């Protein structure tokens, strides 16, 4: 196939000007889509705060106006999903992945409104859910929307504009341009066959998306953790150990989300009214725990700078880790709309800080900072559970800007993904697609 290759080589990277321009417009909208979405989640979280002030005397009435407010917004978001778009539940990265395998539809006329307003209810109630899910699915659909509207033809355009949608989606969610592109490249594309996703174009959409976000967000970063200490060569072995610890935890955590989907499905059976009521109680438990014990609730981005700085005790870290494991399962496995990425950063940090603590006390000759162990453990639940480690690394590299820690971050991450493989575990997004594609047939 030599004369064919010589021909193909000379024709490499000639993306059609039409997809390059349409990549620009998809990114722009997904940036605005995300920006609007973030600002809207923030405004609800504020309103919820301003309510606990008007009622700050009567602590029982306080705990009551805190539970109901998060339940009402949660139910509103559960209902918006079952009634009008049932595949905008949970994260939604499984669906956009399916859409690229051409096994699942992109119902953009339904989910764009369902995910945005439904997410605003669940995220803005302070449930344990990420902006990733929503902005990545919203942005995938926005990519379809413009494919239809301009009726571009070809596989290239469908797969590309679908892809640069999800990419611009994840970049604008974490101010993470590289992490978006690397999410498509390592995790989102169809994994068992060739594809025509133009990468030059996924880049143009990511650029545009991230500029939109910078237009409404500058001067403040999502995670400010400062510049930590370096890691000396004789320390590396301790990071490879930490990864091993994650690689056995990753797959255990996968099992729990899947079974909790089942365990919570038994609660409503399928019934659009039991289900919504359940997420009212779930969201309401979150709105309560957000007043009485904040670090056990919310997206988790708030407690990461605190945990890195060693400002929690080892006893608090154990508490938070158990509780947050619980409320991540209650909130993500229920199917409420919203991602799992962001709370897997939290879980990974808290566990990483605690291991840093013990390593400090066992080895003073090493001159450790426990913060460097949290920063290696931020991308480690990503790597051990959803098995996209090169994305967690470049995500965590981008959000915390401690390049000097690249080696122990890589090293922890391969340890987590190698022990996840070898202890018999499955990439979380793919084992959700499979159970979804395996019922979209078992009905026959």
């Amino acid at each position, epitope marked *: 196939r030599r004369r064919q290759l010589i021909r193909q080589l000379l024709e490499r990277d000639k993306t059609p000007l039409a997809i390059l321009f349409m990549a620009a417009v998809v990114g722009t909208l997904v940036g605005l889509a995300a920006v609007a979405f973030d600002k809207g989640v923030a405004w609800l979280q504020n309103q919820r705060m301003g309510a606990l002030v008007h009622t700050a005397d009567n602590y029982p009435l306080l705990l009551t106006v805190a539970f109901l407010c998060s339940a009402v917004l949660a139910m509103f978001g559960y209902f918006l999903v079952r009634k009008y778009a049932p595949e905008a539940g949970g994260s939604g990265i499984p669906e956009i992945e399916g859409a690229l395998e051409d096994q699942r539809p992109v119902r953009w006329w339904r989910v764009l409104p369902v995910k945005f307003f439904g997410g605003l209810g669940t995220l803005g109630g302070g449930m344990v859910l990420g902006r990733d899910g929503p902005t990545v699915q919203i942005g995938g659909n926005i990519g379809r929307m413009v494919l239809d509207i301009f009726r571009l033809k070809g596989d290239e355009a469908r797969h590309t504009l679908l892809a640069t949608g999800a990419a611009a989606g994840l970049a604008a969610a974490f101010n993470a341009p590289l992490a978006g592109i690397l999410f498509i490249i390592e995790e989102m594309r169809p994994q068992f066959r060739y594809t025509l996703i133009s990468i030059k174009a996924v880049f143009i959409g990511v650029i545009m998306s991230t500029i939109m976000y910078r237009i409404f967000n500058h001067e403040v970063a999502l995670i400010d953790v400062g510049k930590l200490s370096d890691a*000396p*060569l004789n320390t590396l072995w301790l990071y490879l150990i930490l990864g091993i610890i994650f690689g056995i935890f990753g797959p255990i955590f996968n099992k729990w989300v899947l079974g909790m989907q089942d365990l919570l499905h038994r609660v409503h059976g399928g019934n659009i009214t039991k289900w919504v009521l359940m997420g009212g109680a779930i969201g309401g438990l979150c709105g309560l725990l957000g007043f009485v014990a904040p670090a056990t609730s919310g997206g988790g981005f708030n407690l990461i700078p605190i945990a890195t700085a*060693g400002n929690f005790s080892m006893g608090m870290l154990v508490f938070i880790f158990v509780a947050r494991v619980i409320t991540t399962l209650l909130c993500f496995s229920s199917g409420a709309p919203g991602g799992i990425f962001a709370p897997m950063l939290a879980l990974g940090t808290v566990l990483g800080t605690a291991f840093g603590m013990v390593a400090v006390e066992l080895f*003073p*000759q090493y001159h450790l900072e426990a913060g460097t162990f949290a920063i290696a453990g931020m991308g480690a639940l990503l790597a051990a559970s959803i098995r996209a480690p090169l994305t967690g690394i470049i995500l965590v590299l981008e959000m915390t800007d401690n390049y000097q820690l690249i080696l122990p971050m890589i090293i922890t991450g391969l340890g987590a993904t190698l022990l996840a493989q070898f202890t018999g575990g499955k990439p979380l997004y793919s084992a959700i697609l499979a159970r979804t594609l395996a019922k979209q047939e078992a009905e026959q």
Partner: antibody, heavy 121, light 107 residues
Framework: EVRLLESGGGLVQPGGSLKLSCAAS????????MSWVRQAPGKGLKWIGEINPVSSTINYTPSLKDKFIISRDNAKDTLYLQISKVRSEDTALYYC??????????????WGAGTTVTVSS | DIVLTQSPAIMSAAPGDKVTMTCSASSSVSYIHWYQQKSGTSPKRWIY???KLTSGVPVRFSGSGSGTSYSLTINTMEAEDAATYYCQQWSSHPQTFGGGTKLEILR
């Protein structure tokens, strides 16, 4: 140049106290751990303690509750050592040292000139 | 804690002649360092991580060893090589220096 200039050491009475002081010039004094080493007359180099740049971990040699108090003033580019209940054991040349590492086994990167503490009635 | 005993507590050797002191540890020890103290001057870091010469340290100097025994060495001693050489360890905690080895000219 990189210069460590410690001062404060003189004549003190047994059971008294003194506060030594090391003045760092010519490098980013933050980001480094700092340490104190003392050398009793015609004897070996002995380690007192160390302090980490955010003052969050401070270790001292197996010796006594409030004997030593290491602290640092990152804003003033200066490192401090307080010795209490001073015995004649503590008559020594005191060194201020910056710490670094190679393969990760820490060494005493740059020492200063010293100051002498004389403890006598 | 880990006690370090340097071997020729004092010694002399002519210029252009081959000098060798020893550092010996009560337990097992990794990556020793060596400091050179002249009379009236701050100790200088001389060799680190068992073997590595600091920037400036003339190449005649050299370290070696493993586990519980190490050493310093001068292929061709010079005049300005006369000083005390302190070995030092931090493989274990806390760290410990050696008693000293005084090097004087012979004449």
């Amino acid at each position: 140049e990189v210069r460590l200039l410690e001062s404060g050491g003189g004549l003190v009475q047994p059971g008294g106290s003194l506060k030594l002081s090391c003045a760092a010039s010519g490098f980013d004094y933050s980001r480094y751990w700092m340490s104190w080493v003392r050398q009793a007359p015609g004897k070996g180099l002995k380690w007192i303690g160390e302090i980490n740049p955010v003052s969050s971990t401070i270790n001292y040699t197996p010796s006594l509750k409030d004997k030593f108090i290491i602290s640092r003033d990152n804003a003033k580019d200066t490192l401090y050592l307080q010795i209490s209940k001073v015995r004649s054991e503590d008559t020594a040349l005191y060194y201020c040292a910056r710490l670094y590492y190679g393969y990760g086994y820490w060494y005493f990167d740059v020492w200063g000139a010293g100051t002498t503490v004389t403890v006598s009635s | 804690d880990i006690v370090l005993t340097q071997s020729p507590a004092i010694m002399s050797a002519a210029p252009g002649d081959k000098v060798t002191m020893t550092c010996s540890a009560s337990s097992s020890v990794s990556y020793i360092h060596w400091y050179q103290q002249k009379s009236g001057t701050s100790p200088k870091r001389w060799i680190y991580d068992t073997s590595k010469l600091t920037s400036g340290v003339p190449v005649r100097f050299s370290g070696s060893g493993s586990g519980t025994s190490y050493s310093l060495t001068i292929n061709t001693m010079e005049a300005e090589d006369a000083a005390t050489y302190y070995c030092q360890q931090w493989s274990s905690h806390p760290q410990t220096f050696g008693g000293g080895t005084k090097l004087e000219i012979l004449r």
